[PDB]
Design a protein around this ligand. Sequence first.
Ligand SMILES: *[C@@H]1O[C@H](CO)[C@@H](O)[C@H](O)[C@H]1NC(C)=O
Ligand SMILES: *[C@@H]1O[C@H](CO)[C@@H](O)[C@H](O)[C@H]1NC(C)=O
Ligand SMILES: *[C@@H]1O[C@H](CO)[C@@H](O)[C@H](O)[C@H]1NC(C)=O
Ligand SMILES: *[C@@H]1O[C@H](CO)[C@@H](O)[C@H](O)[C@H]1NC(C)=O
Ligand SMILES: *[C@@H]1O[C@H](CO)[C@@H](O)[C@H](O)[C@H]1NC(C)=O
Ligand SMILES: *[C@@H]1O[C@H](CO)[C@@H](O)[C@H](O)[C@H]1NC(C)=O
Ligand SMILES: *[C@@H]1O[C@H](CO)[C@@H](O)[C@H](O)[C@H]1NC(C)=O
Ligand SMILES: *[C@@H]1O[C@H](CO)[C@@H](O)[C@H](O)[C@H]1NC(C)=O
Ligand SMILES: *[C@@H]1O[C@H](CO)[C@@H](O)[C@H](O)[C@H]1NC(C)=O
Ligand SMILES: *[C@@H]1O[C@H](CO)[C@@H](O)[C@H](O)[C@H]1NC(C)=O
Ligand SMILES: [Ca+2]
Ligand SMILES: [Ca+2]
Ligand SMILES: [Ca+2]
Lengths: 451, 471, 474, 482
Amino acid sequence: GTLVQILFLTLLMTTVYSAKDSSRFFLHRAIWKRFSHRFSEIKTVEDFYPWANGTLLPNLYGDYRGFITDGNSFLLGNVLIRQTRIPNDIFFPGSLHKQMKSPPQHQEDRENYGAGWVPPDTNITKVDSIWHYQNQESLGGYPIQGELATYSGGGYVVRLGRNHSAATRVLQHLEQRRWLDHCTKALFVEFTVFNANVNLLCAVTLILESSGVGTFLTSLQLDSLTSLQSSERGFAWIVSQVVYYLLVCYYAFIQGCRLKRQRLAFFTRKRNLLDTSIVLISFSILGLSMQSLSLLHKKMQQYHCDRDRFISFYEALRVNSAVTHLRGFLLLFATVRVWDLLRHHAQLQVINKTLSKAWDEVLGFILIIVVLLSSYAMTFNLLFGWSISDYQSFFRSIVTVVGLLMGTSKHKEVIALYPILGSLLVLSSIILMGLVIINLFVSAILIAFGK
Amino acid sequence: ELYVKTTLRELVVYIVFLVDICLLTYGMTSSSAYYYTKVMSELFLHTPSDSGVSFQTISSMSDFWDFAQGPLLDSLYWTKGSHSFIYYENLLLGAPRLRQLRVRNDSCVVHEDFREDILNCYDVYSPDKEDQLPFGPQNGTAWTYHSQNELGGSSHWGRLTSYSGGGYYLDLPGSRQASAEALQGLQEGLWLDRGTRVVFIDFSVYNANINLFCILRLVVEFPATGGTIPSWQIRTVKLIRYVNNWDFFIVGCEVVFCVFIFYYVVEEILEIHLHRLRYLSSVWNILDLVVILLSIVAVGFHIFRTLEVNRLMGKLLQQPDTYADFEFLAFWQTQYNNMNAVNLFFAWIKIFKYISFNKTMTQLSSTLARCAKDILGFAIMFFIVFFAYAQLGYLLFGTQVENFSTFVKCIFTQFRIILGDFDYNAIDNANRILGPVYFVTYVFFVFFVLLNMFLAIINDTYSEVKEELAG
Amino acid sequence: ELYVKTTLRELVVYIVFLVDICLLTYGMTSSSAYYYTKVMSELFLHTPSDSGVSFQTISSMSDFWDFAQGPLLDSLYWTKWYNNQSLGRGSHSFIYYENLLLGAPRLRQLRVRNDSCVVHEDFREDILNCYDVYSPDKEDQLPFGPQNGTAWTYHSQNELGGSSHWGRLTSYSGGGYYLDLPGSRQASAEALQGLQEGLWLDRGTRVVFIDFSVYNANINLFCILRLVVEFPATGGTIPSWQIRTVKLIRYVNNWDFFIVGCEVVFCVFIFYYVVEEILEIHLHRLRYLSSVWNILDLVVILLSIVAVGFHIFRTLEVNRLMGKLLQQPDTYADFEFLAFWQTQYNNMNAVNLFFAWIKIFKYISFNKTMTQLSSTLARCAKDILGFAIMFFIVFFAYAQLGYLLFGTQVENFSTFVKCIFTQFRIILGDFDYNAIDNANRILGPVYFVTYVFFVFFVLLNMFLAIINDTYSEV
Amino acid sequence: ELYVKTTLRELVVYIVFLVDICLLTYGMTSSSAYYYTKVMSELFLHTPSDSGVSFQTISSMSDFWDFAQGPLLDSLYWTKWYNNQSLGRGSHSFIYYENLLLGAPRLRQLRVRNDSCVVHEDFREDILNCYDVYSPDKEDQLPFGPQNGTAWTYHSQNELGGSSHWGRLTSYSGGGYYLDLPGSRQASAEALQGLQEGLWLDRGTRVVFIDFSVYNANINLFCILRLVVEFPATGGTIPSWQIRTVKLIRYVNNWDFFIVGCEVVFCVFIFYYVVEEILEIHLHRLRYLSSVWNILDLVVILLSIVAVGFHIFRTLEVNRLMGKLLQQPDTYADFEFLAFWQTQYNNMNAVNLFFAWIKIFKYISFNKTMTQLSSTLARCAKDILGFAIMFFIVFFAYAQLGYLLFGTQVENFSTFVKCIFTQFRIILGDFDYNAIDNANRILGPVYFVTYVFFVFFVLLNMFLAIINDTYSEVKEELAGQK
Ligand SMILES: *[C@@H]1O[C@H](CO)[C@@H](O)[C@H](O)[C@H]1NC(C)=O
Ligand SMILES: *[C@@H]1O[C@H](CO)[C@@H](O)[C@H](O)[C@H]1NC(C)=O
Ligand SMILES: *[C@@H]1O[C@H](CO)[C@@H](O)[C@H](O)[C@H]1NC(C)=O
Ligand SMILES: *[C@@H]1O[C@H](CO)[C@@H](O)[C@H](O)[C@H]1NC(C)=O
Ligand SMILES: *[C@@H]1O[C@H](CO)[C@@H](O)[C@H](O)[C@H]1NC(C)=O
Ligand SMILES: *[C@@H]1O[C@H](CO)[C@@H](O)[C@H](O)[C@H]1NC(C)=O
Ligand SMILES: *[C@@H]1O[C@H](CO)[C@@H](O)[C@H](O)[C@H]1NC(C)=O
Ligand SMILES: *[C@@H]1O[C@H](CO)[C@@H](O)[C@H](O)[C@H]1NC(C)=O
Ligand SMILES: *[C@@H]1O[C@H](CO)[C@@H](O)[C@H](O)[C@H]1NC(C)=O
Ligand SMILES: *[C@@H]1O[C@H](CO)[C@@H](O)[C@H](O)[C@H]1NC(C)=O
Ligand SMILES: [Ca+2]
Ligand SMILES: [Ca+2]
Ligand SMILES: [Ca+2]
């Protein structure tokens, strides 16, 4: 009856909780402390050669046959340097002067070239030349959503892998031929590492995005994935995983039979919608969690075949992020179920004695909160949006205003910048909130005294 | 309850007006306007020279001369035409201009005990006491005085004196070694001497990818006590071009907005037929006039700014290598932005007048009228002690702490103490016997006043329901 | 009113006990115990080498061997004044010219076996070694390197009388590969050079301890220093430190010959209170455990008895340590066990004093001063007790969600307990939202704003149920 | 209603007295003081040496001699422009080209005796001497070093005319071993060398003061600098400083010839107020002491006569000091005593002005504005007193617990009153939870969480009792009205 349901729900929360290993944190931090050293001091396009000659090559080939730094993390395959350009229509601004510039976004210059950026020589596309737009498919890539872009895919590609000398040669050959020009948009440096002490595969991507004003926003992105076996752990977890999944399939059978003795009028019974979404999500989690490992094994066979070629693990990491989001959804579904089964088996009201849960009161409260947040967020973003960073955009300003409400974010720069406008706005907000709570108090007084 | 107020026509037309006014106000700004003030503010300020002298680190006159001949020229006249391009894209408009304001030699007569060790004495800056004579070689424009009428300029209410707009100026030449030799000649001769009171360095940059002017000025003040106080001002201007389709859409929104404010002003003047009856008694009939006035001044400044930017760019492309005054335009553009923000706030507020919400909000202004005469008797009784505390803080601290250095700064420091944002350690270090006492007693006073007015509020209704139930 | 309960004679004999406890635990502090740790910390952790590598910024093994030679021997062996003329005290090192250095430092290390894993079945022709994370089962106990000295052979925890350390990752053991530095600075530098040449910190290292002690005689205080560096299995280092200022020898001047009377009256009071508790147990044979103040009395008596026993233990141990230190110098005198247990004893005394202070409300009772809430919760317990339980159940979900979304980039969300305390600190208005914004630009704002709205809703409901209860029918 | 008690004559004469006292307390505080102290402080205790040793960074005896030679003389003695061209005014040090340098700086040191201790059995063969912490009973008064100059012989407080000093550890005496730096920079850079080749800072040292003062004449302001370095019994340093900008010479302007009349008016006003306070003592023999406004009037009159006396004292003292300074230069002119007492007089004036401003409430009166809390506490006095002492018992229990658990690691808990104010700040949402956590990561979170819960509980009880008593009494009077 209820014993099996509460046991199954406790086992489900145990399942979603027990997927915790702190070894994934430090790894990230470790890598982030090595390759992000002196990375923000890159403001031009010729300041990447000296940064990748003492902060990238030393940390990538740390006196070991393969391992990145201090052994531990192995370096899988090969390193890749990718670049996306814009068409060289700077012929119109012969001196980059001030006129009606910015043609329509200068979509990625996907055409071949020659020795320099000299026009091409033939009409075929080579897969080994630094000056040929390769593909998004033939590269096996994915749109790297940077800070202000999407960077739809591939571009012009070079590989500098597996030694220290074979990387210095490539860097010198790219510096002489002037590979990185003023026509370059974002430049990516991507590679991947497998740590075997704690079975963990990480994929690293260093991003340089060219802002409007001539400069470069620098970022670092890492994605991890634990490539453990089906079990390889304690029998308790294994026994707690098998029993939970058999309970899941039993509940699937139960709800299937309940839906055959009730054909279509099952939308109203929301007590079954949660219990069927839970079983669907659990089955999806298990299926994707094994499919990710199958994909990883396929790619590793591909690696063993033709070692010394760039290999991308983006599919496995995408499936892993999908699994994480599914777990995040299942958690809230489980808490909703636990809370709405503890309202009937032991009647505990929450909003009662002031419910007013009709379609008028709740909607009206939502509307007044939305209006009072939008107004303040808009005016704050307009006033201090050019200088302060917390009010840089509209939604950033909404989150900052909610913080102001909670007290998390203290408004001392809005008082330093505009001492009479920001002060007046904060005073208005305070007066409004005080009036609201005083009105609640006086209403609650007057309802229970006037009779 | 949730019900539409007066009419279903005025509500829809006002929703249209609000969407229009909230679309023509967000179309005169730039998403990359905060990344332009940060890239240009870290290039010219946080860039250390040899011996590590940024702009914010300037602390004497020799530091000023290490910043001028160092990271100031290296940032203006960039490396690898007839024109300079900072960061390969930005364009430096016109030519920079150093400007200095002196003070007369005999203005602050010395005391009797020292008038044999200290011969002459230079007062603090004041347009009454200002030197208008040539000095140094008395040769060029950097050594003679030019009034505010020749140097078309305006006051700069920057710090401590609201400085004037004339003075001794020099426009840096086009090259880099030429300007370096100019600054060397200005150093060997004593440009900055005891009489100097303030030095401005102002210039302007224009980006082409994004249409944005970054206009920046850097002020260094040499108080009567020696030293420096570096401050700065970096602003941005749009200069909308009418070549895209979105630009023509914005023009359409502007003409619709003009028609809307005209219709609203006629609808307002029409209902003054109730000459004084019930008109300036309603509160919304003040917000209407306020938003009308603001929306009029908006298009006024829009016309003015178009005219001024056209004149300035014409003067620039007519003859370069001369200072093109962009400070006026930038200052008044920021004023226009603030006015637009306030107008948008009020236009967002009026929706409450147009549509009714939960009975809580409709009785909120009835709750406010409860404390009818208690508040004017509370405002005075609170502000007397508030200002007593403000000046006590200004007198105890205010020589040591910065936030208490003047009166209005004490006012705002206490107002921030109310909001839980303070720095108790500076207060304590300033005076470790009357610091804690001041802090503790001030906080207790604030909490006492708040609790007292809350008691008065919720004790009003007891007597109200008592007299209405037993009357 | 303020009527006194159960007698006025007992309140006096308890106020005397309170004064005696305050004199006991406030006469053994030192006004100069904070500045001691301050100066020693800023001497050993903040001093930068050439290349600017202090102890707090160690991030490799090269950085370690850069600190262990530059700003560690310079900050340990003092033998000349600032004007380059010799101190008048020979063969001893007086740090800061006042602080004797007892014994000799000791570097210690905990390795991990070379084959403590099975590598993944795909990476077997590539990765030939796995070094698992630290645990006393997979711990290397074989010689390495030259395989001759004491720094290259494993000594168990019993040969090295020592105990566990609760580092920032796990709790380490007490064995390992140690080395006691010699007296002079040049001999110690040569020893450390020999340790660096033959590779001492290989891939299998997991911890490195550096422990030593210091005695200042002007004030009467020991300052036991321990500096730990942990090399996780994932890479990097996590430098940590523990600097404990304690008073082990505690009868020197005439003021400390006065506390030896308060200790006697204290044990007499403990005897009196236990013989009173036995009595009032003999008359309430089982009704005795319905007087929760009695649980507090038992707890206070137990803590006092433990604090009496630790005195005997510490006297014996410090006598043994001083004897061993003066008979054979040039060897590590283990002061860290004693310092740790002394600070634990101080913490227990602080808690016991707090309890003895709040035990005043057992005699002096007020009528209904702070009762206007317990009287409310006793009647309206359902929609305020169960509602609170529901809020608690809806909280832990948010803690787990925050550990899921973030928790690989942010640190406050790294573990479950850290998520719990980060949320509890969000309530009080103490948070850095930019971190969780950079970690995720779509779910960060959602998490934050929905959490804020939820906590506002809960506290508003509770305040409404509290204020509309007083106006119910009374 | 805003009815005024105390018939209008008294109100207008008090308004005139208030505007006069305000005029004469704001008319003698220059607005160019903050930047004076700012530039002098960031010149003297922010300038790194060749090794990166500012004043605040001093952390040993070998860093003092690094600062006291590199950036202490480069800042004191200015003799050339920034373009290597000699200043006009000769044989004088014009700091920042404007501020004079009055007299000659002075270095002073206080040592502690050699045998003020016991090592007591075990270190009595390794640690021969022991130097206690500073206290005037344990103080060395014998010559050391070459035992010849003034830097190596003790001069009692009365021979130096010194005075106490409330440092960061103790309060120090006024005597000690001193040295006056000479005129030029070279002559005073080889005087600080005989103090280093011979050990001036040895084990027995306990504090070193460096005092001097400058005078800017553009604005008319003195700036007195004192830089203290304390060497605790544990070794190390604790650098502290006190930089006081004062106006000791009053009348050099035309505005002041009007504050003379303001001072005369203030004197006749305080005379009138004391002569009218005599009458209320005559009429009410002992009913005078009933009200508390009379206590405040007595306090204000006492502070006024004290501020009148200090004026004469300061005039005499500054005349004597300027005479001695211009009569025999190259000697230390003690401006520190006068600067200290002048700042104390300014603080007293500020407090007195605050008292007058809040005393304005006994003349103009509101009807029932801020008696809403006074009227509802008089019905709960005997339980408010029982609530306060319970709250304070447990508050001080928590303060002791915090001082004992932390307090040798965290600085806010270093002492007892610091624990009190740290908790009072925790209430206002100003805490550093990471320091508490790292200090002790089992009892730290327990302390924090339980303290927050306790204070929340007591504020809830206070609010409940407050809003419950009023309802109780109003419904009680409505019931009794039946
Ligand atoms: C790269 O760095 C190494 C050492 O950091 C240096 O020897 C080499 O010359 C550098 N290469 C270039 C091209 O600067
Ligand atoms: C350099 O790498 C290439 C393949 O990337 C390999 O064939 C060659 O042996 C390597 N040489 C050295 C010296 O590592
Ligand atoms: C003082 O000012 C006069 C002008 O009134 C000028 O001629 C003279 O050179 C100045 N003296 C100095 C020392 O600058
Ligand atoms: C400066 O004086 C020179 C003669 O000494 C004169 O030729 C020149 O026109 C003057 N003005 C300048 C250089 O601006
Ligand atoms: C300090 O004394 C030693 C020993 O005589 C000498 O070698 C050295 O040159 C002196 N000076 C220093 C270390 O600056
Ligand atoms: C691991 O280290 C041991 C220690 O001598 C060595 O004998 C062995 O070859 C190493 N490798 C493996 C795979 O065990
Ligand atoms: C190792 O220790 C032995 C002791 O038996 C000694 O003979 C040998 O010289 C030592 N070797 C080294 C390299 O320390
Ligand atoms: C400054 O001028 C003096 C004057 O003799 C000279 O000796 C010294 O070398 C100069 N210093 C410089 C130019 O740095
Ligand atoms: C100890 O103090 C005495 C008292 O003057 C002194 O004579 C003696 O030199 C001191 N001893 C040392 C080692 O400084
Ligand atoms: C040192 O003392 C002698 C007398 O003992 C005295 O004559 C002399 O002036 C003093 N000062 C010196 C030598 O500098
Ligand atoms: Ca109207
Ligand atoms: Ca008992
Ligand atoms: Ca009176």
